[PDB]
Curated annotation (Swiss-Prot):
Site positions per UniProt: Histone H3K4me3 binding: Y5, M16, D20, W28
Gene that this sequence comes from: YNG1
Parent sequence residues shown: 153 to 212 of 219
Organism expressing this protein natively: Saccharomyces cerevisiae (strain ATCC 204508 / S288c) (Baker's yeast)
UniProt note: domains: The PHD-type zinc finger mediates the binding to H3K4me3.
Binding site for Zn(2+) 1: C6, C8, H30, C33
Taxonomic superkingdom: Eukaryota
Subunit-structure text: Component of the NuA3 histone acetyltransferase (HAT) complex. The NuA3 HAT complex has 2 functionally distinct forms that participate in transcription. The NuA3a HAT complex is composed of at least NTO1, SAS3, TAF14, YNG1 and EAF6. The NuA3b HAT complex contains an additional subunit, PDP3. Interacts with H3K4me3 and to a lesser extent with H3K4me2.
Protein name stated in the entry: Protein YNG1
TM annotation in the entry: none
Zinc finger (PHD-type): 3-52
Binding-site residues for Zn(2+) 2, renumbered to this chain: C19, C24, C46, C50
Length: 60
């Protein structure tokens, strides 16, 4: 695909992942955008926040 996902103003070059979090302002982020490889544990949180934001919600 050729668009623009992560807040890095770019799109899916190859290794990608969606904000596997209920909140997460978006559902598509690049590894160059964030920080990881092959999306650790299979599921990765769109951003260091996309993870924390999920912790702030759902069961406290
Ligand atoms: Zn997110
Ligand atoms: Zn980004």
């Amino acid at each position: 695909q050729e668009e623009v996902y992560c807040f890095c103003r770019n799109v899916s070059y190859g290794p990608m992942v969606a904000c596997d979090n209920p909140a997460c302002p978006f559902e598509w982020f690049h590894y160059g955008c964030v920080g990881l490889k092959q999306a650790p544990k299979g599921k990765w949180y769109c951003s260091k926040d996309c993870k924390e934001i999920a912790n702030q919600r759902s069961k406290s």
